[PDB]
Amino acid sequence: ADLTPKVQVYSRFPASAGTKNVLNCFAAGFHPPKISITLMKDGVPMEGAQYSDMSFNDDWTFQRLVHADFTPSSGSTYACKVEHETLKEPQVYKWDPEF
């Protein structure tokens, strides 16, 4: 209820090194709706990201999905970086690769 974004990062399919996949970042629970959500590989923005049309939950708080096609590499670090006016600094969320 603080109106900061709550964020999680997950792959579309169970991940395997070198197998094409999609990386998702879902931010929810925030207000106002303006938000920067950026998928990052080793500190570099991922190309080809797509964002969902602005929508909201039954409690009126806003949410957005960002996703990008990617081929996960062991020894790369993937993250979702979020900027929002409730946040003093950008917040980052690491993807747990599950391999």
């Binding site: 999680q8 169970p14 303006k34």
Partner: protein
């Protein structure tokens, strides 16, 4: 008990962000986006993976209705901040209907300003309810007109239900198709604690359950649930984690219940 729902989620924004539309509508049938509108394209269009054979006539109508809503919201964002003696602003509406197996219907119509409840309409009694004394001005003006209540009764109890029935028929294949979760269990040890994570990838419909168990007994006190979150293709993701002793890793089981599975699935951590 069977039922279906049609919901429209309308957002107008004074500050949507660079290159983002100021007004957006997302429409859902059950747990599925069926269509959208935004103020950049100025077009209402179906999600073809749900509604693959739509006629343009219907969507011309939806487009014009949505353009009207866009105009209505533009005026709200101008007028309401002043009334509240109040930076950026938003207007939201959630409306729609349900049809139930028992033959009945329900209607919903709720508004919010700056992310706070503003106004609601009750189809059955044809009355409005305001969230605060400023909103009460709108409530009283609308009700004294007589027309808003008649028009919304029609919109929810006739138009919405006709469209819901239409999308259920047109979208039958996508709505009834079940997609199984691909479940993975992973383990990671850090500082003497093994965290077990169960992720269910790409399931449809939305309802799912995930439980962690040891020696047959659920460990709900120790479980952290990630929540059910969307994929871009209309399917969903969910997760649960639990922290365990490394030596106990092999005796925990993740149970997943989903409509696509004939029985609850059971999954364990199997490190090499």
């Amino acid at each position: 008990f069977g039922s279906h729902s049609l919901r429209y989620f309308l957002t107008g924004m004074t500050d949507p962000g660079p290159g983002m539309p100021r007004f957006v509508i997302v429409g859902y049938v059950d747990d599925k986006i069926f269509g959208t509108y935004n103020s950049k394209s100025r077009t209402a269009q179906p999600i073809v993976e749900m509604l693959p054979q739509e006629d343009q006539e219907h969507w011309d109508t939806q487009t014009q209705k949505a353009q009207g809503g866009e105009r209505d919201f533009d005026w709200n964002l101008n007028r309401l901040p002043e009334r509240y003696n109040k930076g950026s602003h938003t207007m939201q509406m959630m409306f729609g209907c349900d049809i139930l197996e028992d033959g009945s219907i329900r209607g919903y119509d709720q508004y919010a300003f700056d992310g706070r409840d503003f106004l609601a309409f009750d189809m059955d009694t044809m009355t409005f309810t305001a969230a605060d004394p400023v909103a009460e001005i709108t409530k009283r003006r609308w009700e004294t007109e007589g027309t808003y209540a008649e028009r919304w009764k029609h919109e929810l109890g006739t138009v919405c239900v006709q469209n819901l029935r239409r999308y259920l028929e047109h979208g039958k294949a996508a709505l009834k198709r079940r997609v199984q979760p691909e479940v993975r269990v992973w383990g990671k040890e850090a500082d003497g604690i093994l965290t077990l994570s169960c992720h269910a990838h790409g399931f449809y419909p939305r309802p799912i359950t995930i439980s962690w168990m040891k020696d047959g007994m659920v460990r709900d006190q120790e479980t952290r649930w990630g929540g059910i979150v969307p994929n871009s293709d209309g399917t969903y993701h969910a997760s649960a984690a639990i922290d365990v002793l490394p030596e106990d890793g092999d005796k925990y089981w993740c149970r997943v219940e989903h409509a696509s599975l004939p029985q609850p699935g059971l999954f364990s951590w199997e490190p090499q």
